[PDB]
Amino acid sequence: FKNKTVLKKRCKDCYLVKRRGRWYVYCKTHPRHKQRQM
Template sequence: MNFLANTLRQSLARSSLYLRPIGINSLIREDPALRTTNVFLQPAQLPTLTLVSGFKVRFAVKRRCKDCYMVVRDGRMYNICPTHRRHKQMSFTPSQKTLNTKNITWAGQSKIRPW
């Protein structure tokens, strides 16, 4: 019974909010979200980003256009292009080449399969 009484009170309280006359001025005064819309309409201050293309790491560094040139620094071969920044490449170091190799323990090629 107590549950029904509480539900009835809540529904009457909600309906009284909807039944009273509301003017535009009273709506703006009462609703804090409508008062602060000016802040939300201002342009957002976003950080400026500088787009930089990094080096592509390759085993075989190649020239991709006539403006690309090769440079050797710290035991690596670099391809640098002043006109197309996306052509930048650098080679693996010898230690990286050994990390990326795989040891094949067994390989067989025959016309008859063992299974």
């Protein structure tokens, strides 16, 4: 992951999801697109 204040999708396969009280960015195609809300 990468703690980001402003989550932003980096491609079409990224999808925002709310888990464990904070928004996450998951991308199976590009694992480096994963983000965590800081």
